[PDB]
Design a protein around this ligand. Structure first.
Ligand code: ATP
Length: 368
């Protein structure tokens, strides 16, 4: 039963990966026992070369797969943003996206099997696969982030097959096309690279419809690059119910992404409050309980539970908000209702509650 361990090698490190592979395995044998991350090590070679060793889904002998990676520090071809993968900009993006249904797992597995099928030359006339992915759902769901985070994950997890990755994010809002796709082809010519091309909000092309010619040229250019073994095409759409030309039939991986449920919201807020405690904007630090812990005490209210119960109740009246709004509310909370360097978590929860109420007042104003 395989167990994945992501090893973040320092940018300033010049050690061979084989040496890091040997150290990290020796460390894992020391401890020998859920998801856990190391940021400090007794051993100096690890201190010197590794920023984190993180175990991702209590046991010892499993088949253990390490993925050692080194963030490419400098970020960005216009109209296109370009990142070498793994990119320092996308570090932690994956974990920042909380979904209900374990969408991220399936999404990774689908594209994994797609790349495996590409790589072994499975006749697509006999088993259905292709290099196009469509994330659709309402705005603010994390679709674009999830594409970038998926590209990063795939690159980190397929280091054995590809030495590095590439992400080109075409901005829907925009001859010159042929120059930008010349650039992308030159990246693809390096078969050590796994190249991702991301077309944000594809519905914008059929909505923005000279504009006829610009669209048909991008289609023919996409059709040209999806012919290559090391290409994945990522697309998103904010109109989920509407069929679309022509990425709908274009995509053997379609995936709905919807707004967070009250459970997901709770985990989302927890990740925000943890960060504020880490940075000590919330002080002093208090323990917060998970929903599972609350459920184990029957949601009795006491000193351990009171504030976590209050957060749970804030999560419930946040239902309806998108994740974009949700990760923005702690900033609004702090800016509108604290406006001081430091606040107890009692005071912040109460600030966040007001902010939430303020969102729906604005919503109701947009209605009338
Ligand atoms: N499920 C979620 N959990 C945590 N944060 C989220 C979630 N969904 C959205 N967000 C926050 O909102 C930010 C922006 O979302 P993003 O713009 O990727 O969503 P989108 O509107 O679906 O994408 P686009 O409109 O560009 O196609 C994310 O980086 C994330 O911080």
């Amino acid at each position: 039963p395989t167990v994945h361990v992501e090893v973040h090698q320092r940018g300033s490190s010049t050690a061979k990966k084989e040496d890091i592979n040997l150290s990290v395995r020796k460390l894992l044998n020391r401890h020998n026992i859920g998801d856990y991350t190391w940021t400090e090590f007794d051993e100096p070679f690890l201190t010197r070369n590794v920023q984190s060793v993180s175990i991702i889904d209590d046991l010892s002998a499993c088949t253990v797969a390490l993925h050692i990676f080194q963030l490419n520090e400098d970020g960005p071809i216009i109209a296109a943003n370009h990142w070498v993968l793994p990119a320092a900009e996308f570090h932690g993006l994956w974990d920042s996206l909380v979904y209900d249904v374990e969408v991220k797992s399936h999404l990774l597995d689908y594209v994994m099997t797609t790349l495996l099928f590409s790589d072994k030359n499975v006749n697509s006339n006999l088993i259905t696969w292709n290099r196009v992915v469509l994330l659709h759902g309402p705005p603010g769901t994390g679709k674009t982030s999830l594409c970038k985070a998926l590209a990063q994950k795939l690159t980190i997890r397929l280091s054995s097959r590809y030495r590095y990755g590439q992400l080109i994010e075409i901005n829907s809002h925009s001859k010159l096309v042929t120059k930008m796709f010349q650039k992308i082809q030159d990246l693809i010519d390096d078969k050590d690279a796994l190249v991702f091309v991301l077309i944000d909000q594809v519905e914008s092309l059929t909505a923005a419809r000279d504009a006829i010619r610009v669209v048909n040229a991008v289609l023919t250019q996409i059709d040209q690059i999806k012919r290559h073994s090391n290409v994945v095409i990522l697309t998103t759409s904010n109109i989920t119910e509407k069929i679309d030309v022509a990425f709908v039939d274009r995509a053997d991986i379609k995936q709905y992404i919807g707004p967070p449920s009250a459970a997901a919201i709770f985990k989302i807020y927890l990740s925000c409050l943890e960060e504020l405690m880490k940075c000590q904007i919330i002080y002093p630090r208090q323990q917060l309980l998970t929903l599972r812990e609350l459920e184990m005490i029957g949601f009795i209210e006491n000193n351990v539970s009171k504030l976590s119960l209050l957060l749970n109740d804030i999560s419930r009246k946040s239902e309806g908000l998108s994740g974009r709004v949700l990760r923005k509310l702690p900033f609004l909370a702090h800016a509108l209702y604290v406006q001081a360097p430091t606040v107890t978590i009692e005071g912040f929860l109460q600030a966040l509650s007001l902010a939430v109420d303020k969102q729906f007042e604005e919503r109701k104003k947009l209605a009338a």
